[PDB]
Structure formats: structure tokens, C-alpha cells
């Protein structure tokens, strides 16, 4: 009875960052060496535990969130960051216990005529709270005269398309990101090693 990481990391389709996917992992044993054997392929930063010790640990839930961002935006996937992504798409707590894994995905997600399939939110009333998702597509009101659900002058579509070509300099290229969150609450533990 094993934990289904291959379903997150070997997924050929990945979510857009504004509608990021979450898989919940529980009721299994988590072999973190399946992930650490593959380290030439991702970048990886951990927060609140060490990478090596992960097998040793036990938690009440493990969460895996996945999405695609631009490379120079990977640095916002970290505690206490700001910018479009950290504030309007995906937000980590300050007390984040977990790992942020990322790999360059030019070859998978760029296309000579651009790939516009991946979206981000650029306007919102307020900065998301941690682990919050906004799928809403309703017109953001800038300016005073209110929009009637009609984009136009001072009224925007809140979602915007990345445009990915294989020519772009790294960091204007697409990166797949998996955020692993370790959550040890007060009920009985369920994920171990």
C-alpha cells in the first residue's frame, strides 16, 4: 500500500497556476527515495524538515499541489514572497513545512507558435490567503464606473495567458512545480515511512 507520487510527477497534463491541482495523500507508506533518486531532473528546496530524513517522519496528511509557472517566478513559491503568483494564484504560509519541487518543462510545454494554454490571474481585490484557490473569471473593476460583467475600459478579464515558445530565455520558459505539504494535526497519523 504505497503513496501515489507517480500520479503527480509523471502526469502528462499539468494545471494552470490559478486553478492549481491538489492531490491528498493519506493511508499509505511514502517512499521518498523514489523521488530523491531522480534529483538530476528537478531543483528542490525544503522548508521545516531536511530532505534526507523524510522516510523517518510520520504525518496526518501529505498534500501535493502542482501547476505550471514561468521560470523567473519559481522564487515566489516560498514562504513570505510577493508578486503576481504568490499573491493571486498560489500562496504558501510563513510556517510552511514541506518541499517545493520544480523542473524546467521547455520541450513539454513550449510550442514554436506559442502555447497559450496556461493561465495566471493578474488582478484581484485582495492577496490570497495560504493554500487558497480562485477559479472565478469575473471582471475586475479598476476605476470607478462599474462594469456589468463587461470587460473594457478599466474593467479586465482577471485571467491572462502565458505565451511559451522554445526560443525564450530560461525563466521566460515554463516550469512544472510540485509543492509537497506535510501536515501533522491532532488526530491519528496516517502517512509514514
Amino acid at each position, epitope marked *: 500500500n504505497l503513496c*501515489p507520487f*507517480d*500520479e503527480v510527477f*509523471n*502526469a*502528462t*497534463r499539468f494545471a494552470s497556476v490559478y486553478a492549481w491541482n491538489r492531490k491528498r495523500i493519506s493511508n499509505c507508506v511514502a517512499d521518498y527515495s523514489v523521488l530523491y533518486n*531522480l534529483a538530476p*531532473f528537478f531543483t528542490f528546496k525544503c522548508y521545516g524538515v531536511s530532505p534526507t530524513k523524510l522516510n523517518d517522519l510520520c504525518f496526518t496528511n501529505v498534500y501535493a499541489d502542482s501547476f505550471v509557472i514561468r521560470g523567473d517566478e519559481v522564487r515566489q513559491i516560498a514562504p513570505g514572497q510577493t508578486g503576481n503568483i504568490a499573491d493571486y494564484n498560489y500562496k504558501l504560509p510563513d510556517d510552511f513545512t514541506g518541499c517545493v519541487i520544480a523542473w524546467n518543462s521547455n*520541450k*513539454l510545454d513550449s*510550442k514554436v507558435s506559442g502555447n497559450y494554454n496556461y493561465l495566471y490571474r493578474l488582478f484581484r481585490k485582495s492577496n490570497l490567503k495560504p493554500f487558497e484557490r480562485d477559479i472565478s473569471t469575473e471582471i475586475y473593476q479598476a476605476g470607478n464606473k462599474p462594469c456589468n460583467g463587461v470587460a473594457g475600459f478599466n474593467c479586465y478579464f482577471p485571467l491572462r495567458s502565458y505565451s511559451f515558445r522554445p526560443t525564450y530565455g530560461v525563466g521566460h520558459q515554463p516550469y512544472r512545480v510540485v509543492v509537497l505539504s506535510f501536515e501533522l494535526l491532532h488526530p491519528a497519523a496516517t502517512v509514514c515511512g
Partner: antibody
Amino acid sequence: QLQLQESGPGLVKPSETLSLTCTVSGASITSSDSYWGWIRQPPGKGLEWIGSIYYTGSAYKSPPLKSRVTMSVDTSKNQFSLKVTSLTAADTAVYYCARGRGSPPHYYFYFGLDVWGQGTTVSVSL
Amino acid sequence: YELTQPPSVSVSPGQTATITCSGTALPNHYAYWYQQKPGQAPVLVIYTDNERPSGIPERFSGSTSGTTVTLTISGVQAEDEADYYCQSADSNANVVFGGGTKLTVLG
């Protein structure tokens, strides 16, 4: 000009074991984006993937058949092989050599099965 | 793990055909479409959800929406009579093919 050609017997006895060989022409079997695989089709029925293999010997195997499938890459002679133990009637099919165009580490079908051999008919009878 | 696909679709000439394919892991994995004509190797007509390889006519186009993907063959010709296979992969990354749909050009 990537083309593929299956070799292999046409008749095999039940229980015996099946041996297939695909030769690659027009490209190196070491193409970093190539996952060489086998798909079969029982006469009258639909396609079934058996397994794929990278130029390193990394082998992806269908779960129904994992127990009795083996594959190998002859880097020297630009070809890959399939072996299926304990044939039964249910193993009668056309067997297709194919190239999955994908990307490392494990996207062995990312861009689809875009180039196919044209099949070797395999027939499992006593 | 199983992709579900109508056994037969029939279409008047010059008109437009819809092959749907449903499977619970299409949220995780792209769809692929292969065309097979009698006694012959399958031919990839759609990779990832909607990419058309080079020598494939524009009337083939792929579409996704949830746990269903669809091949759409605009302006059907007689040559388009074939067997069409959707292909994806299960929760793990295991390739799986649908059952296939005969496309009959009526009239």
C-alpha cells in the same frame, strides 16, 4: 528518415515463448527523445500496449503482461527486442514495433506513438 | 483502467463527425488519436490534446473538456472511413487505448 521493421516468427506453440526484434532505420536508436515500444492487436480487436524501452535499458511494462514481458536495446546493432513467456491462444495478434516520442525522465509517450512498423503476424497454435 | 468510446459513428459526406472518449484519468493525461485503415498500421492524427502532426489535414482537430476528449473530423470524406482509437494512460503512467470507433460514411 525514421522507419521501423519487425522480425519474428509467425507460428509459435502454446506455452512456448515469443521473440521479436525491431530494427530502426533512418535514425539512431539512441535518440534522447525515443521510447521504443510494442503494441499488439488481436485479430478483430483493439490496440494494446505491451511495453516500451529507452536506449539505456529503462523498461516500461504494461501491468497485465509485466510478469512475462522482457525487452532489450542492442545499441550496437540499432535494434530493440521483445520476449513474451508462456504464450496462449490469447496472445495471437498482430505485433507492432513503434516509436513513442517523449522526453526524459519518464514521459515515454509524451508526443504520441508517431512512427509504427507495419506489423508481424503472430499465431499461437499447436 | 478503461477509456470508453462509441463502437460506431456514421456521418453524411461533407459533414462533421464526433468521436468521444471518456476515462477517469483524462484529468491527469493527454489524449491521442490514431487512424487505422483495413490491414494497416495505425496512424497518429492527434497528439497531446489537439496537436496535428505534419501531414494531417486541418479537418482533424482535437478537443478536451473534463473526463471526455473528442476527435472532430470536419467535412468527412470517403477516405476518412477508418477505425479511430483514442489513447491515454491510467493513474500511473500506463498507456491505454480505447476500444475504437468505426466511422462509416453514409450515402
